[PDB]
Amino acid sequence: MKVLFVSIGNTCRSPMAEAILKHLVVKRNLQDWYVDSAGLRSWNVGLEPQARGQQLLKQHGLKTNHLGRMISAQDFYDFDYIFAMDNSNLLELEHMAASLTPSPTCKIQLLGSYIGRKEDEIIEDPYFIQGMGGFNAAYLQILESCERFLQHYKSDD
Ligand SMILES: [Cl-]
């Protein structure tokens, strides 16, 4: 129903994940789904996703509007899943959640743990990787991750 993707910058991995899952739920015609993304630093806040990721997305029929924003405390109460790309992200989000006095009930998880191959768990930050190889690996990891995640949430178990 409500899913938040989280990357450190909210400018590469998380906006791509947001747009990808947004596409999947329409191509699967699901309801009542809400997908968003947020970040853990002010670095790229208030800007649009990094241009070479919007290109890779367009090259797959997807587009993103998204302005980089920080995760807020409210986010932890308004989402069912919050997905980290990194174990760094995960640890910061786990510390964050435990600092909120009414403990939240969002599930906070490494998105890549749905891939099913531990050697492919980690979705690396492509921001500083020269060329497109970092974005391409991340896109594929994010796509499979979202696919297996949806397969699991619809399942009767
Ligand atoms: Cl398609």
The residue type of 85 is M
How many A from CA of 89 to the centre of ligand 1?
29
Which residues fall within 8 angstroms of residue 133, CB to CB, at 6 or more apart? none
Burial of 33 (0-12, 13-18, 19+ CB in 10 A): middle
> Which value in Å is the resolution of this experimental model?
2.2
Which residues fall within 8 angstroms of residue 94, CB to CB, at 6 or more apart? 108
How many A from CA of 96 to the centre of ligand 1?
36
CA dihedral sign of residues 4, 39, 66, 86: negative
**Domain that includes residue 7, residue range:** 1-157
Q: Number of structural domains, the chain?
A: 1
Checking DSSP bridges between strand 107-110 and strand 34-39, what pairing results, if any? unpaired
Burial of 113 (0-12, 13-18, 19+ CB in 10 A): middle
How many A from CA of 60 to the centre of ligand 1?
7
- Using alpha carbons, list the distances in angstroms from residue 10 to 6, 7, 29, 152: 7, 5, 26, 26
